[PDB]
């Protein structure tokens, strides 16, 4: 990972960040024993390989909020720690890879079109989708799952249209066996995210958008531990006579 | 490490700390590539075993500033990452353990008395001293040094008096082969601390004080990377006809 940040810019960010932390220490009268606990906890975060998790939960939403000021298209949201690049390509009408266990879940059929800011359909568009299964596990982050379970790269049609069948995601508990869970426990918080799909949508000459879609009335939608839920991203699927939930959501991309 | 912090108190500290960081992100328009660099750097800090160092340099001064509000005795300062408990006891007039190489350095003879707030001499007092050698290394943090090089626990006399001979400390460069050095380099900072002694002074029924003593006119005294230098802690030793530097500094302890 590399960035184009000048020493002047880093100096000013660092001064603000450390002054802020130091101001919090002074405000609350943080004590030596608390300092010692905080030191050991930072150590434990690294030892438990929890930096991507902790930062994506507690910090990433503010970085997307920065990016969100520059964009007029579909609302973005955090990537979170579970994206995997180069998931297998699928045709514009498709079903995500899933297990026999996954076929017992109520289907979700997600339709729409990738467009530009004027509403024009984009050819060449791709929709990379990934999400957790009904047990709350992500493929490649749980030894029991096929590596592409509920992951795919959907190639949209000449109009940018897609129709994707998957399973209805359910709420995700963040890992709590570790330092991040310990942090949440210590302050009587809760370690839940609402049910969600993740997507990255792209197209020739377009700025990709990384976003998430949630479900109206879903639990935790108003208290997402990751502060990543936006009202614009809440879907309201309708159940068909076949018992499947149908929903249409279009993506609007800013130009690159 | 353990603390007596309530979930209410942690919740409020956490909200302030994360809101502060998030406010800095928004203020400066921190970008995704910078977020990615910051994530990897946090990882590298843990992998390089640099948490105690980074926190003692950039954070500990604010925790001592909290403690400093409660105390009327000798000004305190940070402990830093190099204290070792149970260093060998020495009589109230003594020389710190040192090597043949160390005997080539101008001696420093440090005298004084441990007192209470009224100026009364305290019996039972101890002065634990440690500091770097002229090469800028600390014993137990450099494979080539005897483990108690320039470390000792001085037992003060029935009046709380001490006379301790050591070598004149010289400026300390923080380790820069690692993530902390990288941080400082990236913002054109400098990785130096002024020359200093560390001390922890204690006595029956007294609150110990952890402090540091610096040297008038010494380099970096006005730009300590650790922000740990206080004007009250700057010594002004005078050179004797024997070529040794002499200085008297008394310690005043708050009651426990
Ligand atoms: C992006 C960089 C990240 C910056 C971090 C910002 C968040 C700051 C808050 C982090 C404090 C972490 C506290 C988790 C400790 C878990 C409980 C534990 O293991 O210790 C327990 C102690 O008992 C507890 O209930 C935990 C007490 C927590 C008190 C520590 C608060 C420290 C706050 C200092 C941070 C100030 C930053 C400004 C061990 O008992 P066994
Ligand atoms: C107590 C918890 C600690 C909280 C941390 C507070 C300090 C925040 C500032 C930390 C940013 C660390 C930047 C060090 C990166 C070193 C250079 C490097 O390795 O990347 C380099 C990249 O080139 C560089 O010059 C470094 C660019 C640094 C830009 C990253 C700034 C990130 C700021 C985000 C923090 C905001 C917190 C609020 C790799 O090139 P090869
Ligand atoms: C921060 C975070 C944690 C868990 C997830 O599943 C996710 O998408 C984001
Ligand atoms: C923060 C820090 C770094 C190096 C030292 O020698 C010290 O005493 C303190
Ligand atoms: Fe997720
Ligand atoms: Fe030191
Ligand atoms: Mg609880
Ligand atoms: Mg430089």
Coordinates of C-alpha atoms and ligand atoms in Angstrom, one line a residue:
Chain A
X1 CA 0.0 0.0 0.0
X2 CA 1.3 3.4 -1.1
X3 CA -0.1 7.0 -0.9
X4 CA 0.8 10.3 -2.4
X5 CA 0.9 12.2 0.9
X6 CA 3.5 15.0 1.5
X7 CA 5.4 15.4 4.8
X8 CA 3.5 18.7 5.3
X9 CA 0.2 16.9 5.0
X10 CA 1.2 14.0 7.2
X11 CA 2.6 16.4 9.8
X12 CA -0.7 18.3 10.0
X13 CA -2.8 15.1 10.1
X14 CA -0.5 13.7 12.8
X15 CA -0.5 16.8 14.9
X16 CA -4.3 16.9 14.9
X17 CA -4.7 13.1 15.6
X18 CA -2.3 13.1 18.5
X19 CA -3.5 16.3 19.9
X20 CA -7.1 14.9 19.7
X21 CA -6.1 11.7 21.6
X22 CA -4.2 13.7 24.1
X23 CA -7.2 16.0 24.6
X24 CA -9.4 13.0 25.3
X25 CA -6.8 11.7 27.8
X26 CA -6.9 15.1 29.6
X27 CA -10.7 15.5 29.4
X28 CA -11.4 12.1 31.0
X29 CA -8.4 12.0 33.3
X30 CA -7.2 8.7 31.9
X31 CA -5.0 7.0 34.6
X32 CA -1.8 5.0 34.4
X33 CA -3.6 1.7 35.0
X34 CA -5.9 2.5 32.0
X35 CA -2.9 3.5 29.9
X36 CA -1.3 0.1 30.7
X37 CA -4.5 -1.7 29.7
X38 CA -4.7 0.3 26.4
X39 CA -1.1 -0.6 25.6
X40 CA -1.7 -4.3 26.1
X41 CA -4.9 -4.2 24.1
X42 CA -3.2 -2.5 21.1
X43 CA -0.6 -5.3 21.3
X44 CA -3.3 -7.9 21.5
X45 CA -5.1 -6.4 18.4
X46 CA -2.0 -7.0 16.3
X47 CA -1.3 -10.4 17.8
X48 CA -4.9 -11.5 17.0
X49 CA -4.6 -10.1 13.4
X50 CA -7.6 -7.8 14.1
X51 CA -6.4 -4.5 12.6
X52 CA -8.4 -4.8 9.4
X53 CA -11.5 -5.7 11.4
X54 CA -11.2 -3.0 14.1
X55 CA -10.4 -0.3 11.6
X56 CA -13.1 -1.3 9.2
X57 CA -15.6 -1.3 12.0
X58 CA -14.6 1.9 13.8
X59 CA -12.8 4.1 11.3
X60 CA -13.6 3.2 7.7
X61 CA -17.1 4.9 7.7
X62 CA -15.4 8.3 8.1
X63 CA -13.1 7.6 5.1
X64 CA -16.0 6.7 2.9
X65 CA -17.8 9.8 4.2
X66 CA -14.8 11.8 2.8
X67 CA -15.2 10.0 -0.5
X68 CA -19.0 10.5 -0.3
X69 CA -18.6 14.3 -0.6
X70 CA -17.0 14.0 -4.1
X71 CA -19.7 11.7 -5.5
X72 CA -23.2 12.4 -7.0
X73 CA -24.0 8.8 -7.9
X74 CA -25.3 5.8 -5.8
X75 CA -24.5 6.2 -2.1
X76 CA -21.3 4.3 -1.2
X77 CA -20.5 2.4 2.0
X78 CA -17.5 0.7 3.6
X79 CA -15.8 -2.3 1.9
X80 CA -15.3 -4.0 5.2
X81 CA -12.6 -6.7 5.7
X82 CA -14.0 -9.5 3.5
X83 CA -13.7 -8.4 -0.1
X84 CA -11.8 -10.9 -2.4
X85 CA -10.7 -9.8 -5.9
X86 CA -11.3 -11.8 -9.1
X87 CA -14.4 -13.8 -8.0
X88 CA -15.6 -16.0 -10.9
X89 CA -17.5 -14.1 -13.7
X90 CA -21.2 -14.8 -14.1
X91 CA -23.6 -13.9 -17.0
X92 CA -26.0 -11.0 -16.5
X93 CA -28.8 -13.3 -15.3
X94 CA -27.3 -15.8 -12.9
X95 CA -27.3 -17.5 -9.5
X96 CA -24.4 -17.0 -7.1
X97 CA -22.4 -20.1 -6.2
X98 CA -23.8 -21.7 -3.1
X99 CA -24.0 -25.0 -1.2
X100 CA -26.8 -27.4 -0.8
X101 CA -27.3 -26.0 2.7
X102 CA -27.7 -22.5 1.1
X103 CA -30.5 -23.7 -1.2
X104 CA -32.8 -24.1 1.9
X105 CA -32.8 -20.4 2.4
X106 CA -35.5 -18.0 1.0
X107 CA -34.0 -16.7 -2.4
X108 CA -33.4 -13.1 -3.1
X109 CA -33.6 -12.0 -6.7
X110 CA -31.9 -8.7 -7.2
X111 CA -32.5 -6.8 -10.5
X112 CA -31.5 -3.5 -11.9
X113 CA -29.4 -1.6 -14.2
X114 CA -26.0 0.2 -14.0
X115 CA -26.4 3.8 -15.3
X116 CA -24.6 7.1 -15.6
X117 CA -25.6 10.4 -13.9
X118 CA -28.1 11.1 -16.7
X119 CA -29.8 7.7 -16.3
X120 CA -28.2 6.2 -19.4
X121 CA -27.6 2.4 -19.3
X122 CA -23.9 1.4 -19.4
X123 CA -22.4 -1.4 -21.4
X124 CA -19.3 -3.2 -20.1
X125 CA -20.5 -2.9 -16.5
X126 CA -19.6 -5.4 -13.7
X127 CA -21.2 -6.1 -10.3
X128 CA -19.0 -7.9 -7.8
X129 CA -21.2 -9.2 -5.1
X130 CA -20.3 -10.9 -1.9
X131 CA -22.0 -11.5 1.4
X132 CA -22.4 -13.8 4.4
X133 CA -24.4 -17.0 4.5
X134 CA -27.3 -17.7 6.9
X135 CA -24.8 -19.0 9.5
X136 CA -23.0 -15.6 9.4
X137 CA -19.8 -16.8 7.7
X138 CA -18.0 -15.5 4.7
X139 CA -16.2 -17.7 2.2
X140 CA -12.4 -17.7 2.6
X141 CA -12.9 -16.6 6.2
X142 CA -14.3 -19.9 7.4
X143 CA -12.5 -23.2 6.7
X144 CA -15.7 -25.1 5.9
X145 CA -16.9 -23.1 3.0
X146 CA -16.1 -23.4 -0.8
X147 CA -13.9 -20.5 -1.6
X148 CA -16.4 -18.7 -3.8
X149 CA -19.5 -19.4 -1.8
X150 CA -21.8 -16.3 -2.3
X151 CA -19.2 -14.4 -4.3
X152 CA -19.2 -13.5 -8.0
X153 CA -18.5 -11.0 -10.7
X154 CA -21.7 -10.4 -12.7
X155 CA -21.2 -9.2 -16.2
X156 CA -24.2 -6.9 -17.0
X157 CA -25.9 -7.0 -20.4
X158 CA -25.5 -4.5 -23.3
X159 CA -27.9 -2.2 -21.5
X160 CA -26.1 -2.6 -18.1
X161 CA -29.0 -4.8 -16.8
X162 CA -28.5 -7.6 -14.3
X163 CA -30.7 -10.2 -12.6
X164 CA -28.9 -11.9 -9.7
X165 CA -30.3 -14.7 -7.5
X166 CA -28.8 -15.3 -4.2
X167 CA -30.0 -16.0 -0.6
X168 CA -31.5 -13.5 1.7
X169 CA -28.6 -12.4 3.9
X170 CA -29.1 -12.4 7.7
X171 CA -27.4 -10.2 10.4
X172 CA -23.6 -10.6 10.8
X173 CA -22.0 -10.8 14.2
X174 CA -18.5 -9.6 14.2
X175 CA -15.8 -12.0 15.6
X176 CA -15.9 -11.5 19.4
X177 CA -13.3 -14.1 20.6
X178 CA -10.7 -11.4 20.3
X179 CA -9.6 -7.9 21.2
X180 CA -12.2 -6.1 19.2
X181 CA -15.0 -8.2 20.9
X182 CA -13.3 -7.4 24.2
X183 CA -13.5 -3.7 23.4
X184 CA -17.2 -3.9 22.6
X185 CA -17.9 -6.1 25.7
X186 CA -16.1 -3.7 28.1
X187 CA -18.4 -0.9 27.1
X188 CA -21.7 -3.0 27.0
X189 CA -21.9 -2.4 23.3
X190 CA -23.1 -4.9 20.8
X191 CA -21.2 -6.7 18.1
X192 CA -23.8 -6.8 15.3
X193 CA -24.2 -5.5 11.8
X194 CA -27.5 -5.6 10.0
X195 CA -28.1 -8.1 7.2
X196 CA -26.3 -6.8 4.1
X197 CA -25.0 -7.4 0.5
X198 CA -21.7 -6.0 -0.5
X199 CA -21.1 -4.7 -4.0
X200 CA -18.5 -3.0 -6.1
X201 CA -19.9 -1.8 -9.4
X202 CA -17.8 -0.6 -12.3
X203 CA -17.9 0.3 -15.9
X204 CA -15.6 1.6 -18.7
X205 CA -14.6 5.2 -18.0
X206 CA -16.5 5.2 -14.7
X207 CA -15.5 5.6 -11.0
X208 CA -16.4 2.4 -9.3
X209 CA -18.6 2.5 -6.3
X210 CA -18.2 0.2 -3.3
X211 CA -21.5 0.0 -1.5
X212 CA -23.8 -2.1 0.7
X213 CA -27.5 -2.7 0.6
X214 CA -29.6 -3.5 3.7
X215 CA -33.2 -4.7 4.3
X216 CA -36.1 -2.6 5.5
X217 CA -37.2 -3.6 9.0
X218 CA -34.1 -5.7 9.5
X219 CA -32.6 -5.9 13.0
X220 CA -29.6 -3.7 13.9
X221 CA -30.3 -1.4 11.0
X222 CA -30.5 1.5 13.4
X223 CA -27.5 0.4 15.5
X224 CA -24.9 -1.0 13.1
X225 CA -21.7 -1.5 15.1
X226 CA -19.8 -0.3 12.0
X227 CA -21.8 2.9 11.5
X228 CA -22.1 2.0 7.8
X229 CA -25.8 1.9 7.2
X230 CA -27.4 4.7 5.2
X231 CA -31.2 5.2 4.6
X232 CA -30.6 5.4 0.8
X233 CA -29.2 1.8 0.9
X234 CA -32.1 0.1 2.5
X235 CA -34.0 -2.2 0.1
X236 CA -37.6 -3.2 0.5
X237 CA -38.0 -6.6 -1.3
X238 CA -41.5 -7.9 -2.1
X239 CA -42.2 -11.6 -1.8
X240 CA -43.5 -13.4 -5.0
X241 CA -46.0 -16.2 -5.2
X242 CA -43.0 -18.5 -5.6
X243 CA -41.9 -17.4 -2.1
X244 CA -38.8 -15.6 -3.4
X245 CA -38.0 -12.0 -2.4
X246 CA -37.7 -9.6 -5.4
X247 CA -36.0 -6.3 -5.4
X248 CA -34.8 -3.8 -8.0
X249 CA -32.0 -1.4 -7.4
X250 CA -30.1 0.6 -10.0
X251 CA -26.6 1.8 -9.7
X252 CA -25.6 5.2 -10.9
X253 CA -21.9 5.8 -11.5
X254 CA -19.9 9.1 -11.4
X255 CA -17.4 9.5 -14.3
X256 CA -13.7 8.6 -13.8
Chain B
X1 CA -2.5 -5.2 33.3
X2 CA -5.9 -4.4 34.8
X3 CA -7.9 -1.2 35.5
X4 CA -11.0 -0.3 37.5
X5 CA -12.9 1.3 34.6
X6 CA -16.7 1.0 34.3
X7 CA -18.4 0.3 30.9
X8 CA -20.0 3.8 31.2
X9 CA -16.6 5.4 31.5
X10 CA -15.0 3.3 28.7
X11 CA -18.0 4.0 26.5
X12 CA -17.6 7.8 26.9
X13 CA -13.8 7.6 26.4
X14 CA -14.3 5.5 23.3
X15 CA -16.9 7.7 21.8
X16 CA -14.7 10.8 22.3
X17 CA -11.6 9.1 20.9
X18 CA -13.3 7.6 17.9
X19 CA -15.2 10.8 17.2
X20 CA -11.9 12.7 17.4
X21 CA -10.2 10.5 14.9
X22 CA -13.1 10.5 12.6
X23 CA -13.2 14.4 12.9
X24 CA -9.6 14.5 11.8
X25 CA -10.3 12.2 8.9
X26 CA -13.1 14.5 7.8
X27 CA -11.1 17.7 8.4
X28 CA -8.2 16.6 6.3
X29 CA -10.1 14.6 3.7
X30 CA -8.1 11.5 4.4
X31 CA -8.3 9.3 1.2
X32 CA -8.6 5.5 0.7
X33 CA -5.0 5.1 -0.3
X34 CA -4.0 6.9 3.0
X35 CA -6.4 4.7 4.9
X36 CA -4.7 1.6 3.4
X37 CA -1.2 2.9 4.3
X38 CA -2.4 3.7 7.9
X39 CA -3.8 0.1 8.2
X40 CA -0.6 -1.5 7.1
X41 CA 1.5 0.8 9.4
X42 CA -0.6 -0.2 12.4
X43 CA 0.1 -3.8 11.5
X44 CA 3.8 -3.1 11.1
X45 CA 3.9 -1.4 14.6
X46 CA 2.7 -4.6 16.2
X47 CA 4.9 -6.8 14.1
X48 CA 7.9 -4.8 15.0
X49 CA 7.0 -4.9 18.7
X50 CA 6.9 -1.1 18.7
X51 CA 3.7 -0.4 20.7
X52 CA 5.4 0.5 24.0
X53 CA 7.8 2.8 22.1
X54 CA 5.3 4.5 20.0
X55 CA 2.9 5.1 22.9
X56 CA 5.5 6.2 25.3
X57 CA 6.8 8.7 22.7
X58 CA 3.5 10.1 21.5
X59 CA 0.9 9.4 24.1
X60 CA 2.4 8.9 27.6
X61 CA 3.1 12.6 28.2
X62 CA -0.6 13.3 28.3
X63 CA -1.2 10.5 30.9
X64 CA 1.5 12.0 33.1
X65 CA 0.0 15.5 32.6
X66 CA -3.3 14.0 34.2
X67 CA -1.3 12.6 37.1
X68 CA 0.6 15.9 37.3
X69 CA -2.7 17.8 38.2
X70 CA -3.0 15.7 41.4
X71 CA 0.5 16.3 42.7
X72 CA 2.2 19.1 44.5
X73 CA 5.7 17.5 44.9
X74 CA 8.6 17.2 42.4
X75 CA 7.4 17.5 38.8
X76 CA 6.9 14.0 37.2
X77 CA 7.7 12.9 33.7
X78 CA 7.1 9.8 31.5
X79 CA 8.6 6.4 32.5
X80 CA 9.4 5.6 28.9
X81 CA 9.8 2.0 27.7
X82 CA 13.1 1.1 29.4
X83 CA 12.4 0.8 33.1
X84 CA 13.4 -2.5 34.7
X85 CA 12.3 -3.4 38.2
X86 CA 14.5 -4.8 41.1
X87 CA 17.8 -3.2 39.9
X88 CA 20.6 -4.0 42.5
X89 CA 20.5 -2.0 45.7
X90 CA 23.3 0.5 46.4
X91 CA 24.3 2.4 49.5
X92 CA 23.3 6.1 49.8
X93 CA 26.8 7.1 48.5
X94 CA 27.6 5.0 45.5
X95 CA 28.6 4.7 41.9
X96 CA 26.3 3.1 39.3
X97 CA 27.5 -0.1 37.7
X98 CA 29.3 0.6 34.5
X99 CA 31.8 -0.7 32.1
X100 CA 35.5 0.2 31.5
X101 CA 34.2 2.0 28.3
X102 CA 31.9 4.0 30.6
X103 CA 34.7 5.1 32.9
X104 CA 36.1 7.3 30.0
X105 CA 33.1 9.6 30.2
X106 CA 33.0 12.8 32.3
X107 CA 31.4 11.8 35.7
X108 CA 28.3 13.2 37.0
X109 CA 27.8 13.3 40.8
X110 CA 24.2 13.8 41.7
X111 CA 23.4 14.8 45.3
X112 CA 20.3 15.6 47.2
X113 CA 17.7 14.6 49.7
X114 CA 14.2 13.0 49.5
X115 CA 11.8 15.2 51.5
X116 CA 8.0 15.6 52.1
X117 CA 5.9 18.6 51.2
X118 CA 7.0 20.5 54.3
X119 CA 10.7 20.0 53.5
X120 CA 11.3 17.2 56.1
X121 CA 13.9 14.5 55.2
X122 CA 12.5 11.0 54.7
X123 CA 14.1 7.9 56.1
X124 CA 13.5 4.6 54.1
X125 CA 13.7 6.4 50.8
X126 CA 14.8 4.7 47.6
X127 CA 15.9 6.2 44.3
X128 CA 15.8 3.9 41.3
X129 CA 17.9 5.4 38.5
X130 CA 18.5 4.3 35.0
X131 CA 19.7 5.9 31.8
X132 CA 21.5 5.4 28.5
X133 CA 25.2 5.2 28.0
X134 CA 27.2 7.5 25.8
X135 CA 26.6 5.3 22.8
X136 CA 22.8 5.8 23.3
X137 CA 22.0 2.3 24.5
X138 CA 20.1 1.0 27.5
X139 CA 21.1 -2.1 29.4
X140 CA 18.8 -5.1 28.7
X141 CA 17.8 -3.4 25.4
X142 CA 21.2 -4.0 23.7
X143 CA 22.8 -7.4 23.6
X144 CA 26.3 -6.1 24.3
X145 CA 25.7 -4.5 27.7
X146 CA 25.8 -6.1 31.2
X147 CA 22.2 -6.3 32.4
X148 CA 22.5 -3.7 35.1
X149 CA 24.7 -1.2 33.2
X150 CA 23.7 2.3 34.6
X151 CA 20.8 1.0 36.6
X152 CA 20.5 0.8 40.4
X153 CA 18.3 1.2 43.4
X154 CA 19.9 3.7 45.8
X155 CA 19.0 3.3 49.4
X156 CA 19.1 6.9 50.9
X157 CA 20.5 7.5 54.4
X158 CA 18.5 8.2 57.6
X159 CA 17.9 11.7 56.5
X160 CA 16.9 10.8 52.9
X161 CA 20.2 12.0 51.6
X162 CA 22.0 10.5 48.5
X163 CA 25.2 11.0 46.6
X164 CA 25.2 9.1 43.3
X165 CA 28.1 9.0 40.8
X166 CA 27.3 8.1 37.2
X167 CA 28.3 9.2 33.7
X168 CA 27.0 12.4 32.0
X169 CA 24.1 11.1 29.9
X170 CA 24.0 12.2 26.2
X171 CA 21.1 12.6 23.8
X172 CA 19.1 9.5 22.9
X173 CA 18.0 8.6 19.4
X174 CA 14.8 6.6 19.3
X175 CA 15.1 3.4 17.2
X176 CA 14.4 4.4 13.6
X177 CA 14.8 1.1 11.8
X178 CA 11.0 0.5 12.4
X179 CA 7.5 1.8 11.9
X180 CA 7.9 4.6 14.5
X181 CA 11.1 5.9 12.7
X182 CA 9.1 5.6 9.4
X183 CA 6.3 7.7 10.9
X184 CA 8.8 10.4 12.0
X185 CA 10.7 10.3 8.7
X186 CA 7.5 10.6 6.6
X187 CA 6.7 14.0 8.3
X188 CA 10.3 15.3 8.3
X189 CA 10.4 15.1 12.1
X190 CA 13.3 14.2 14.2
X191 CA 13.8 11.2 16.3
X192 CA 15.8 12.7 19.2
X193 CA 15.3 13.0 23.0
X194 CA 17.5 15.3 25.0
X195 CA 20.1 13.8 27.4
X196 CA 18.3 12.6 30.5
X197 CA 18.3 10.5 33.7
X198 CA 15.3 8.5 34.7
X199 CA 14.2 8.2 38.3
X200 CA 11.6 6.6 40.4
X201 CA 11.7 7.9 44.0
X202 CA 9.8 6.3 46.8
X203 CA 9.5 6.3 50.6
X204 CA 7.3 4.7 53.3
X205 CA 3.8 6.2 53.2
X206 CA 4.6 8.2 50.1
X207 CA 3.4 8.3 46.6
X208 CA 6.3 7.5 44.4
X209 CA 7.2 9.9 41.6
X210 CA 8.5 8.8 38.2
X211 CA 10.5 11.6 36.7
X212 CA 13.3 12.7 34.4
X213 CA 16.1 15.2 34.8
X214 CA 17.7 17.0 31.8
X215 CA 20.7 19.3 31.3
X216 CA 20.7 23.0 30.8
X217 CA 21.8 24.0 27.3
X218 CA 21.5 20.4 26.1
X219 CA 20.5 19.7 22.5
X220 CA 16.9 18.8 21.8
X221 CA 15.8 20.1 25.1
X222 CA 13.3 22.4 23.3
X223 CA 12.3 19.8 20.8
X224 CA 12.0 16.5 22.6
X225 CA 10.3 14.0 20.3
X226 CA 8.4 12.6 23.4
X227 CA 7.2 16.0 24.6
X228 CA 8.4 15.0 28.1
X229 CA 10.8 17.8 29.0
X230 CA 9.7 20.3 31.7
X231 CA 11.6 23.5 32.6
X232 CA 11.5 22.4 36.3
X233 CA 13.5 19.3 35.5
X234 CA 16.5 20.9 33.8
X235 CA 19.6 20.5 35.9
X236 CA 22.5 22.9 35.7
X237 CA 25.6 21.0 36.9
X238 CA 28.9 22.8 37.7
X239 CA 32.3 21.3 36.9
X240 CA 34.7 20.7 39.8
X241 CA 38.5 21.0 39.7
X242 CA 38.5 17.2 39.4
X243 CA 36.7 17.7 36.0
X244 CA 33.4 16.1 37.3
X245 CA 30.1 17.7 37.0
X246 CA 28.2 18.2 40.3
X247 CA 24.6 18.8 40.8
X248 CA 22.2 18.8 43.7
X249 CA 18.5 18.1 43.2
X250 CA 16.1 17.2 46.0
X251 CA 12.9 15.2 45.6
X252 CA 9.7 16.2 47.3
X253 CA 7.0 13.5 47.7
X254 CA 3.3 13.8 48.0
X255 CA 1.7 11.6 50.6
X256 CA 0.2 8.2 49.6
Ligands
LIG1 C1 -6.9 3.8 14.9 C2 -6.0 3.6 16.2 C3 -6.9 3.0 17.2 C4 -7.0 4.0 18.4 C5 -7.9 3.3 19.5 C6 -9.1 4.2 19.9 C7 -10.0 3.5 20.9 C8 -9.5 3.8 22.3 C9 -10.1 2.9 23.4 C10 -9.3 1.6 23.4 C11 -9.3 1.0 24.9 C12 -9.3 -0.5 24.8 C13 -9.9 -1.1 26.0 C14 -10.1 -2.6 25.8 C15 -9.7 -3.4 27.0 C16 -10.5 -4.7 27.1 C17 -10.6 -5.2 28.6 C18 -9.2 -5.7 29.0 O1 -8.6 -6.6 28.3 O2 -8.6 -5.3 30.2 C19 -9.2 -5.8 31.4 C20 -9.4 -4.6 32.4 O3 -10.8 -4.5 32.8 C21 -11.7 -3.8 31.9 O4 -12.9 -3.9 32.0 C22 -11.1 -2.9 30.8 C23 -10.8 -1.5 31.3 C24 -10.6 -0.6 30.1 C25 -10.0 0.7 30.5 C26 -8.9 1.1 29.5 C27 -9.3 2.4 28.8 C28 -8.1 2.9 28.2 C29 -8.4 4.2 27.5 C30 -7.2 5.0 27.0 C31 -7.4 5.4 25.6 C32 -7.4 6.9 25.4 C33 -7.1 7.3 24.0 C34 -7.3 8.8 23.8 C35 -8.3 -6.8 32.1 O5 -9.1 -7.4 33.2 P1 -8.7 -9.0 33.2
LIG2 C1 -2.8 5.2 20.0 C2 -3.3 4.7 18.7 C3 -2.4 5.2 17.6 C4 -3.2 6.1 16.6 C5 -2.3 6.6 15.5 C6 -2.2 8.2 15.5 C7 -1.3 8.7 14.4 C8 -1.9 8.7 13.0 C9 -0.9 8.9 11.9 C10 -0.4 7.5 11.5 C11 -0.1 7.4 10.0 C12 1.1 6.5 9.8 C13 1.9 6.9 8.5 C14 3.2 6.1 8.5 C15 3.5 5.5 7.1 C16 4.9 5.5 6.9 C17 5.3 5.5 5.4 C18 4.9 4.2 4.7 O1 5.2 3.1 5.2 O2 4.0 4.2 3.5 C19 4.7 4.6 2.3 C20 3.8 5.7 1.6 O3 4.5 6.9 1.3 C21 4.5 7.8 2.5 O4 5.3 8.7 2.4 C22 3.6 7.6 3.7 C23 2.3 8.3 3.4 C24 1.5 8.5 4.7 C25 0.1 8.8 4.5 C26 -0.8 8.0 5.4 C27 -1.5 8.9 6.4 C28 -2.7 8.1 7.0 C29 -3.4 9.0 8.0 C30 -4.7 8.4 8.5 C31 -4.8 8.6 10.0 C32 -5.9 9.4 10.4 C33 -6.3 9.2 11.8 C34 -7.3 10.1 12.3 C35 4.9 3.5 1.4 O5 5.7 3.9 0.3 P1 6.8 2.7 -0.1
LIG3 C1 -16.7 -3.6 9.4 C2 -17.4 -4.9 8.9 C3 -17.4 -6.0 9.7 C4 -18.1 -7.1 9.2 C5 -18.6 -7.2 7.9 O1 -19.3 -8.2 7.4 C6 -18.5 -6.0 7.1 O2 -19.1 -6.1 5.9 C7 -17.9 -4.8 7.6
LIG4 C1 9.5 7.8 24.9 C2 10.9 7.5 25.3 C3 11.8 7.0 24.3 C4 13.2 6.8 24.6 C5 13.6 6.9 25.9 O1 14.9 6.8 26.4 C6 12.7 7.4 26.9 O2 13.2 7.6 28.2 C7 11.4 7.7 26.6
LIG5 FE1 -20.1 -7.7 5.5
LIG6 FE1 15.2 7.4 28.3
LIG7 MG1 -22.9 -7.2 26.8
LIG8 MG1 14.5 13.8 7.8

